[PDB]
Amino acid sequence: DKRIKDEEDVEKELGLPVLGSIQKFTTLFVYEKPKSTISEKFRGIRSNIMFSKGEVKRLLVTSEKPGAGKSTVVSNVAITYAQAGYKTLVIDGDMRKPTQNYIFNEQNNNGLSSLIIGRTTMSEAITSTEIENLDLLTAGPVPPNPSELIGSERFKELVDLFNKRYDIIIVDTPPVNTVTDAQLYARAIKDSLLVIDNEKNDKNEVKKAKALMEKAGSNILGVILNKT
Template structure:
């Protein structure tokens, strides 16, 4: 008999809230600073997080980076761009609907789909009802209009996208965002898949501003999130 996999409580994932003085939280502040350095010479209102494959931690990192920017005083929007296996509603313990798909398919007004995160300065837009045509919705004119409207409302808009090698969604969305960050899980991500993910993003004209090495173990009880320039 197999044991049911235990879900990690959301509060343990949001270390920037639960333990702001920890080593990991400090690394998120370092990551925030490096993103700002990368944004220095270019206007970068929209930022996308993706990975080569599933389970590499890109959703957790996207959420903590969003919180970190909000803690700095920025007005931040975190959008669940994974319309196949969304997770933001779990992470922030809120409802999946209404959300992004309500806007893209039925033109719901912004005030009906935006949610409070519980963090000052950070708003959420969850997935909404899971659609049958995610790639088409993300590539639509409605998505373009949505992005432009959100850029006018927020200092930075952060998208959590699906893994690059699983579906075309991340490529489509990365083409619409100002910057893309690729998350790599230490000791787990296949190097060949990282190269393939980079090539796929480049093919869609994504602006890859860097990569993140996730789950690098420093010592017992601590995990290290580190930002790198583009080295893959």
């Protein structure tokens, strides 16, 4: 059996700390249901991100394969920062299958893709959410040339601008073994979390993703075990 099943599997096989476990189970739990056991676990993840580091100003969230729960982690972890009084920007950096816009119920007409090429403005592309201190930069329209936008100069410089006025930036991404989008993001965003599907995963896949992220220069803060 190739599956990574727990904190011990994680430490031995990946040499990273488990920063939080989310149980299996209407999606923004930290907001909609602040009293749930699952919400507290997200606040625990925020706590462990703080112990893991220096302080975390930019965070990339990724996984080895689709469906791991990247997006759910991004959304909820971002909310725990906002409610703690930090100015927080979620960037939906998944321009292949954008999803933050559905999660927060915001319109994805302008977003990252069109911001990068300059077809929209910062004020236009960034939307304030219903959660105080939490802004959302949706993915924008799905571009033909994602790799090219991510590796661009406007992106690196937009991140720098954003980080002048946001305490923390949390960036959702496409799976690592699927496309190289996350590795490219690692140029502008050094710190990262790896989200693992506890019920369904391959030890070797997760190692490859970790190696790929480490090769792109990413500081992997730790792992989130999901659907445990």
